[PDB]
Amino acid sequence: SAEPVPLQL
Amino acid sequence: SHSMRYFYTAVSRPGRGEPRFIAVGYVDDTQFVQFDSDAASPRGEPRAPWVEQEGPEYWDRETQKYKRQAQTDRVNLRKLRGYYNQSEAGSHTLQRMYGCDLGPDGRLLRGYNQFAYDGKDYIALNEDLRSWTAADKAAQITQRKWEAAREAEQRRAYLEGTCVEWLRRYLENGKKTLQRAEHPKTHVTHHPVSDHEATLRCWALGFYPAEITLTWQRDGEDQTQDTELVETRPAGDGTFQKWAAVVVPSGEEQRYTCHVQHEGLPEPLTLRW
Amino acid sequence: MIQRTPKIQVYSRHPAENGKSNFLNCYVSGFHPSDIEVDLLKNGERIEKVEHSDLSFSKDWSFYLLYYTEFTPTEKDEYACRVNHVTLSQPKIVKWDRDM
């Protein structure tokens, strides 16, 4: 399973 | 000796428009998932039989995640273009690698969350999972943003609990192929070069897992500098291939011994021509 | 933007047997950016049913790709791999060697 919330830089 | 890794590739195209978003997910050297933004209706794709038994509703959730990430990397690439004072003209790349190494029990050994922009390190999650290493001034912006948001503390829960729970489910579901080691099939080939030289080649074939290293020894001495080594190559059936080679004098071949260390090998093999 | 030159390995899946079925591989690795033209050749021609792996990367961020075609070695037919990338001044052609 992928990490749910995406990483915003 | 198991790890789950996720690999993301975001490639912008000249001017505006949707970027190219590719997501690969692996359990060690076995891939179980692909996502490709390049499809008019993009979907999560199972690449291993052990995730095919996993519900169709699980398969929508993976797709929504990658559809969220693809939408998110367009803004990420846009921001970095601005961090590097770059135009919409020209293609750029943003890569993320995240994942978990399984401990000796059902615990996290190590957690990873790192980025590269145009194939240069950008920002990395440190081993403590609380901290980050920014490579440039730009990444320090992401770092100050991330330290204020407490992003590392937030990302910790996934690496520790979720990433681990899933690797474990997959390791139980695929116990047949994922939890076994296939030893290499060793042999040596000899190839005269001149009146005074000959190449000695030690082949390792049909092994799983990957790059579990070969060596050539002259009279007990490891040839760490004279060894011609090829990169570990996928055979294409889930097994791997590698060879180690050494140029030797005309009639001196007997001094050279090939050594093989593999988790599928209960004892390190010694072989000659 | 850092640009890296591809590493090319041309080889078969199982050991070569003339007349017997096999799968021809071309492993491209250590390249950056991701845009690449990879082709498998039968007598310097382009094989049409050449399939590929889903783009992925290594610890250094370098990309890798596996192209493959189910083939039959013979002695006469000459298979090779052709690769094109920003880095290459002209495409690279790497001959399949049975003992490579």
Author numbering:
A (entry chain C): 1 to 9
B (entry chain A): 2 to 274
C (entry chain B): 0 to 99
Can you provide the manuscript's text about this entry?
Within the HLA-C*05-SAE complex, there are four main anchor residues, P1-Ser, P3-Glu, P7-Leu and P9-Leu. The P1-Ser is surrounded by seven aromatic residues, arising from the floor of the antigen-binding cleft (Tyr7, Tyr67 and Phe33) and from the α1 and α2 helices (Tyr59, Tyr171, Tyr159 and Trp167), as well as hydrogen bonding to Lys66. In addition, the P7-Leu places its hydrophobic side chain underneath Arg156 and binds within a hydrophobic pocket lined by Phe116 and Trp147. Similarly, the F pocket of HLA-C*05 was ‘filled’ by large aromatic residues (Phe116 and Trp147), which were absent from HLA-C*07 (Ser116 and Leu147). In addition to the larger Trp147, the hinge of the α2-helix of HLA-C*05 differs from HLA-C*07 by two other large residues, namely Glu152 (Ala152 in HLA-C*07) and Arg156 (Leu156 in HLA-C*07). Consequently, the antigen-binding cleft of HLA-C*05 is composed of residues with large side chains, and accordingly offers a more shallow cleft (volume 1, 200 Å3) in contrast to the HLA-C*07 cleft that is deeper and narrower with a larger volume (1, 500 Å3).
HLA class I molecules, encoded by HLA-A, HLA-B and HLA-C, are highly polymorphic and can bind and present a range of intracellular peptides to cytotoxic CD8+ T cells, as well as regulate innate immune responses by interacting with killer cell immunoglobulin-like receptors (KIR) expressed on natural killer (NK) cells. To elucidate the role of α1/α2 domains and the peptide-binding cleft of HLA-C on differential expression, we solved the structure of HLA-C*05 in complex with a HLA-C*05 specific peptide, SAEPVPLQL (SAE), and HLA-C*07 in complex with a HLA-C*07 specific peptide, RYRPGTVAL (RYR)27. HLA-C*05 and HLA-C*07 differ by 22 residues, of which 15 are located within the α1/α2 domains, with ten of these being involved in peptide interactions, namely Tyr9, Thr73, Asn77, Lys80, Tyr99, Asn114, Phe116, Trp147, Glu152 and Arg156.
